[PDB]
Amino acid sequence: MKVITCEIAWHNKEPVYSLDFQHGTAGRIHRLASAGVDTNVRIWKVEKGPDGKAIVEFLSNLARHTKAVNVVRFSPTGEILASGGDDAVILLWKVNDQLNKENWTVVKTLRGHLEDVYDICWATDGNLMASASVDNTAIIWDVSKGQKISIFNEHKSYVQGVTWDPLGQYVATLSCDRVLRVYSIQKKRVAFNVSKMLSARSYRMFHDDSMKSFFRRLSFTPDGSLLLTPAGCVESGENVMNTTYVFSRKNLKRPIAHLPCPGKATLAVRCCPVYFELRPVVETGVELMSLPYRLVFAVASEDSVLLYDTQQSFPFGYVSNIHYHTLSDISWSSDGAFLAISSTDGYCSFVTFEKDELGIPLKEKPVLNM
Amino acid sequence: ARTKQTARKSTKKPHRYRPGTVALREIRRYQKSTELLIRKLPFQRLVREIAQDFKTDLRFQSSAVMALQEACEAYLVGLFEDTNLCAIHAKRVTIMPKDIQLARRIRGE
Amino acid sequence: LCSQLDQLLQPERRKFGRMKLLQFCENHRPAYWGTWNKKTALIRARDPWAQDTKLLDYEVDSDEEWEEEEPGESLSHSEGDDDDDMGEDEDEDDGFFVPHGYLSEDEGVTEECADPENHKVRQKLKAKEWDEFLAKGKRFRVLQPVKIGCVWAADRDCAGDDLKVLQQFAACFLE
Amino acid sequence: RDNIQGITKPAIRRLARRGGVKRISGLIYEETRGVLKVFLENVIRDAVTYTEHAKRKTVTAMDVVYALKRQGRTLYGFG
């Protein structure tokens, strides 16, 4: 595990906000896209150098954006990319067969949030689309036809994170009003809605609008049995403290536990899409969930990023004091060996993972019950 | 010794940088200058009055007001060396209001 | 030393070179700074005033650079930097302050929060603002990167400093 | 309604000094104040749009930040 601060010109010093790897190809080589206020989407090629360093190179640029972009995520297939800017429109791109080695062309023209967009989510197949914006609205799109199908207006404040159940039965959304909602697929309504919890004094678990954070990103576990929510509040005494909550499919009202994070505040939660064998450890309650196969995920705080696995409660991987400004986004490589760190300073950073450093990836990927 | 003498009285516009080979690490621009260099109170009164102009029954925070401040002079310096480069290209050193307008349009405000 | 003294006595930037600068007080022309790469054997330190044929014209460019003839206010020096003005204000109607702002926010917007909790939050925010004001005197502070390697509970020969540092980052479970 | 000139000559000359000039126009001052005013107005109105869309009365500096990015600039140390 080695951490590389990226000193290269990313968006000619404009801050980064979103980034994504290529899930379709499991090869060591990776195609990386980035989000900045230059209204420019820049594709970059990354791979380990001869010294193992994650060295990067430009690939192509997108400049159609009349406005700044906030969230950028590829399809699970990775062949088609979702692009979202302040100009209140989302275009879909596919590579087409002086400074752009390849041309990437808009494929679909999706609107429905008529405001700045914060978050986008792909389905478990890449044919259904989830997106989050200023507009306090949750939208649902069909990638195949590229038209709006659903609108959820129950939110009172801004929504900074949406995610799709990999099983395909839930949609999880948060408001900036310290309110969390889970949505069914067939029912298309608020399956779950949690904002306050009794201890038995009752108080809200999430941080108010007073936070100096811009994004509240979170993701389903690729297994889909664990739900992770950053920007949590734990009031142990007269004070409240930053944390993130972990939820299981058994109950989405009461999280299984939480991870307190002294100092800075969590803003983004991402899970590596690869599985690993159960690391040999004493049979205790240290593990967050007991599963036949383990998984490792990254959490983006205000400044720090922390690494947790299925067996351990304390973070095994800890990094801090690397980016001067607050964090913006975190991305996992398809192989999981590249963990791309993006902040709001204007640069990114990488942490290279050697093969098997995080365990043996499963020989056969366990199926997910739809 | 040495003969002495009496002294006499003495009287392209977007400079975007290419995606590669750009590792500029200006650290000063990261941190706030903590150097207001503006009289706080005319600024505050002006903000209060224009706010009343727009809407009423509203309150501010000193943090928000000071933030407004550095936003102000940050935009000032940006436009300001923009005008400097314009006037140098304009083959002149005395700054004209047309220079401000031309730089303003260079950004596209 | 002294004893012996008495005894005996009795394109690439590296391809262009160093940045060059020149300023003249007399010029209406602005001061110039640029890298010079022109190589002429006629302009030598031995004969600085020798003609530079096919290199440049011996013609005045400061006048055409800046024929000022305008009220520039002589901003260069001796005026304006020292001038300053004080004043007195009113801040009782619309309080642009941390305590008054918090009070206006709490009066206008009411939530499901206890009054002692609101007082504690206001005190904590004021303390944070005061600490920020005190740390404002730090000004620029060069910051060194920190990185903690993959230390695991299996290993016991790792540095105990990093061990206690990550122990400070414990994961607190709840019953 | 008569605070358009509240911007002081010392403040404007000091801004001039920070940016690095040595010669200034005499009438440019009102143009500076007007550009100030327009940008101030854009900023504050957009912040109001947020705070109203925030369903809130007292605006926060977070609204300032969002207006800043919407118009397209960066804020340092406050996020």
Next chain:
Amino acid sequence: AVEERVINEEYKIWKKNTPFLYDLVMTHALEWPSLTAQWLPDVTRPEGKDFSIHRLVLGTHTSDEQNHLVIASVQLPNDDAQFDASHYDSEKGEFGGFGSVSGKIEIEIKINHEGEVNRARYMPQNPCIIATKTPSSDVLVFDYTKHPSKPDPSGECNPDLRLRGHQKEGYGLSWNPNLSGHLLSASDDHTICLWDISAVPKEGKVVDAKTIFTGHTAVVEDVSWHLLHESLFGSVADDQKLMIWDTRSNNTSKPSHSVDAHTAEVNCLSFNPYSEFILATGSADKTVALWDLRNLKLKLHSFESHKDEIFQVQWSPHNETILASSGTDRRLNVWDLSKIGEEQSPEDAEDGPPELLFIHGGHTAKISDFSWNPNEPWVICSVSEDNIMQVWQMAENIYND
């Protein structure tokens, strides 16, 4: 008229040709001409800045105005800023750019002075204490830390110390780098006054004549301590005489050694900051003679490049074998000892001997004074009589090849 026009045209030519020959030129026009000018050992390098700051002690030559001793702080861009790719000009094909951000010259403290400051020098160990020469017999000592920054509204100066022993003005003052408080003074009175201020009381103001030398029969032009010797110093006077005195000698009238200097009167002298056996003296016969302290009978080398009297000669804290001199020719000539006895083509010899390496003729008037920057190498400020003060540095390739 004709002379003024030809000097103007020569200066215009020098202005046009300086981009190829200088790497650093920083010219300013003074309110009043300065007879004295010198660096400060202290340098200011604020963190987070792309520049360095340097300080200068100068005086004023006012015919009917209160002469003020002046400290000038000067802004110098950093070495780190010396390598940056900002922009490129398609016209000049270089990384140029006129811009507007540059180092600046700022006067910090002015101290009232009784008449023109004939010569100003400070403690080699304490920049707080500075010694100034007056047109009167008096010798005054000023301290910026012990005086208000702005000159006092009262016209009368406020000297912290006044020294006695001389009967009229002079142009020679020096300090002892190895011994604290030891001053060497020169005056038209044909007397060389040695003063020690280390023993002056806190409230004392008048300093007596600790030692008066009278070996010279002419106007003692300059006196200076030895850079390494703790008790040795030399004197130069209008009697074309190079005199060596030892403070340990029991006789203040009998010199330690007496050797003639030239066929013309000599002005100053200078020793190596590193060596201790070689001294440089400039004379009115357009010659500067090197003297080995092993044998003063034979001149080590008498360089010849000026057309008139040479006034001030100074060695290099950076480079042991580097010397330059300026006089009424308005030309400052940089001289190297590594090119001594080197064959050169006549095309490089019409100007003069190959002993010379560089000439600075950017002076409208006679070069009043110069000093070599102990911190920054090759960095020199010189002042002409027309209150013209430039800070300059030549092309790097002229000495580094």
